[PDB]
C-alpha cells in the first residue's frame, strides 16, 4: 500500500465521462486502491533542480516515496479528470502537487489542496473530479490516434508524472509518487505494479 504510519492513499482514479442523451459512460484510464526500485535509476526522468525528486528524497521521510508502473487503458469525451482519496492520523491541510514531465522537465504543474473531514476517528481528504489539463487530454487523444500500441509505448518512454503530497503548515512531504506508463493490451483493463523507492 502507498502509505506511511501517518498518511495513506485510499484511491486514485483517472477517467473520462461521457453523457449522450440518456446514456452515461465512465472509462477508467488508471485505478489505484511490495518490490523495491533503486531511486537513482529514475532521477533523470524527473526535474532535478531545487525541490526536485532527488532533493525531496534526501529531505525525507524516505518511506513516503513510491514508484507506480501503470498500464493505462486507452481502449475507449465530456470530462477528463482524476478523483483521489487519502487518510491521515493528523489534522493537516493536504496540498497535492502533480507535475507532468516530458524529457524529465516540468511542462504542467497542478496544485490542489483539501481541508480535512473527521470520519471514524481519522482525517479523510477527497480531491473530487480534478479536471485533467489540456496537455494530458490532447496527449491521450494523440496516443490513441497512433495505429499501434508499440508506437504509443515508445512515445511514453519520455513521459512521467510526479505527485508530491505535503502538509500545508509544516511543508513536510507526506507522500510522493512517481508514475511511469505503458498502454494496456487491447483485451485488458488497467493494471499496475507499486514499488517502494530505496537506495541500494
Amino acid at each position: 500500500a502507498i502509505a506511511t504510519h501517518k498518511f495513506r492513499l485510499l484511491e486514485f482514479t483517472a477517467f473520462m465521462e461521457i453523457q449522450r442523451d440518456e446514456i452515461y459512460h465512465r472509462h477508467l484510464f488508471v485505478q489505484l486502491g511490495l518490490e523495491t526500485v533503486d531511486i537513482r535509476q529514475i532521477f533523470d526522468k524527473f526535474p532535478e533542480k531545487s525541490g526536485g525528486l532527488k532533493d525531496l528524497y534526501e529531505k525525507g521521510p524516505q518511506n513516503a516515496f513510491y514508484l507506480v508502473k501503470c498500464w493505462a487503458d486507452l481502449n475507449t469525451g465530456d470530462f477528463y479528470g482524476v478523483t483521489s482519496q487519502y487518510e491521515s492520523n493528523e489534522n493537516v491541510v493536504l496540498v497535492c502537487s502533480t507535475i507532468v514531465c516530458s524529457f524529465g522537465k516540468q511542462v504542467v504543474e497542478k496544485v490542489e489542496s483539501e481541508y480535512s473531514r473527521l470520519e471514524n476517528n481519522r482525517y479523510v481528504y477527497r480531491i473530487q473530479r480534478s479536471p485533467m489539463c489540456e496537455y494530458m487530454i490532447n496527449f491521450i487523444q494523440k496516443l490513441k490516434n497512433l495505429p499501434e500500441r508499440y508506437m504509443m509505448n515508445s512515445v511514453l518512454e519520455n513521459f512521467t508524472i510526479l505527485q508530491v503530497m505535503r502538509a500545508r503548515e509544516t511543508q513536510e512531504t507526506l507522500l510522493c509518487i512517481a508514475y511511469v506508463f505503458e498502454v494496456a493490451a487491447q483485451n485488458s483493463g488497467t493494471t499496475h505494479h507499486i514499488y517502494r523507492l530505496i537506495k541500494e
Binding site: 523495491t36 529514475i42 504542467v108 504543474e109 480531491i127 480534478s130 512515445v155 518512454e157 505503458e182 514499488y195
Partner: protein, 44 residues
C-alpha cells in the same frame, strides 16, 4: 474551484516533440536498459 494549473508557454510544441522523438528523431535511456525488477515490464 480547487485547482491551480501552471502550463509551460510552449506546451503545444512540447507535446509535438514527445511524438517527434519517435516519428522524426534528431538521448534518454529506455527503462528496459536500467536496473529494474522483471515485473516492471510484465502486466499483472
Amino acid at each position: 474551484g480547487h485547482q491551480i494549473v501552471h502550463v509551460r508557454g510552449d506546451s503545444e510544441t512540447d507535446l509535438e516533440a514527445l511524438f517527434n522523438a519517435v516519428l522524426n528523431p534528431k538521448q534518454t535511456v529506455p527503462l528496459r536498459l536500467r536496473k529494474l525488477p522483471d515485473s516492471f515490464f510484465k502486466p499483472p
